[PDB]
Amino acid sequence: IDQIDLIHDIEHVIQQFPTVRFTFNKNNGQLFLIGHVRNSIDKSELLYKVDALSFVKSVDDNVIDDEAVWQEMNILLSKNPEFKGISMQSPEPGIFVISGYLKTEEQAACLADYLNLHFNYLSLLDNKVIIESQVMKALAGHLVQSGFANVHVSFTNGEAVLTGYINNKDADKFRTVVQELQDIAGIRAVKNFVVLLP
């Protein structure tokens, strides 16, 4: 008398949760599920909806809460004093992003190692982390190369600080040079205390 249409029913639910997939065993009624959701709230809504299907006897839940995964990661990072300026986020189910500032490449390498060994979703991770010594080098490089040999600089977590001396006649040039230093990935801020000589 027409059995319930199993397939249409299941798909009406799982189509609301991107990255979700399924299998059904009609001999014993077991529904298999896998994939990602943004957080524990989303996961909850999914599981109720398939549980509600007439023909579904049981559920093997292999779906991942993404939020749990990166907050856990951020805790672990914070315990390493070298990783202080670094954190992880997720913009979309099944995607992770790591960002911020480390001091040296030595510190960058430790970070990489730590993730291969200690993160299970490396295949889903975007890395955006900056190295401060590499930015600092390039800042100091560009100034001198530009003619400003008595301006010192220092970078740390997005901010660059300028001090020392320029000839009064070079104030307008110095301004454009700085606007160039800003094109470097990871510059978020600049402080100028350069003094002009008359």
Side-chain angles (χ1 to χ4, degrees):
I1 195 180
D2 287 69
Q3 174 180 284
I4 292 156
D5 189 334
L6 285 48
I7 301 315
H8 286 137
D9 286 2
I10 292 175
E11 277 166 5
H12 193 76
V13 178
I14 67 135
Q15 289 172 327
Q16 316 168 257
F17 294 92
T19 77
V20 175
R21 300 299 175 268
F22 84 91
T23 291
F24 184 76
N25 181 352
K26 71 196 84 194
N27 293 116
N28 71 17
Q30 179 196 58
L31 177 77
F32 174 98
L33 300 183
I34 185 145
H36 301 259
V37 291
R38 153 182 208 160
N39 61 44
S40 38
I41 289 158
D42 299 330
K43 189 144 175 193
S44 291
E45 55 179 10
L46 165 58
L47 305 173
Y48 190 79
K49 280 166 190 170
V50 299
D51 274 330
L53 292 184
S54 288
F55 45 83
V56 173
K57 203 74 187 141
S58 60
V59 181
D60 199 353
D61 178 2
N62 307 95
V63 172
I64 299 148
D65 153 34
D66 288 339
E67 181 181 88
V69 176
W70 55 263
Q71 299 177 325
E72 163 57 354
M73 280 302 319
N74 289 345
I75 292 168
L76 289 161
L77 299 165
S78 80
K79 314 215 145 269
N80 211 56
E82 314 111 277
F83 308 156
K84 267 179 202 319
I86 296 316
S87 52
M88 191 178 286
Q89 303 294 316
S90 176
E92 198 149 15
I95 314 180
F96 296 95
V97 188
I98 189 144
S99 60
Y101 299 87
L102 296 170
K103 267 190 77 186
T104 60
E105 283 140 15
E106 333 202 285
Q107 297 193 350
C110 211
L111 184 48
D113 298 352
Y114 187 89
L115 311 184
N116 198 4
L117 251 46
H118 306 111
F119 184 58
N120 299 339
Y121 300 102
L122 190 36
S123 72
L124 308 172
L125 185 55
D126 193 340
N127 168 31
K128 286 166 190 290
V129 171
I130 305 310
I131 312 183
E132 290 175 359
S133 62
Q134 307 180 170
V135 174
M136 155 96 75
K137 246 170 293 191
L139 278 173
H142 204 83
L143 283 162
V144 301
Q145 287 172 18
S146 306
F148 296 104
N150 302 123
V151 168
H152 181 87
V153 275
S154 62
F155 190 70
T156 13
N157 86 318
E159 168 175 77
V161 181
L162 317 156
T163 70
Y165 295 98
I166 68 161
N167 196 32
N168 187 74
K169 307 186 166 194
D170 307 318
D172 291 314
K173 175 166 298 311
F174 185 55
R175 142 73 83 213
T176 63
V177 142
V178 174
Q179 300 202 326
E180 278 147 45
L181 299 179
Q182 290 164 185
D183 310 328
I184 284 177
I187 301 296
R188 286 169 161 205
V190 173
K191 265 191 199 188
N192 187 24
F193 308 111
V194 181
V195 42
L196 319 181
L197 293 171

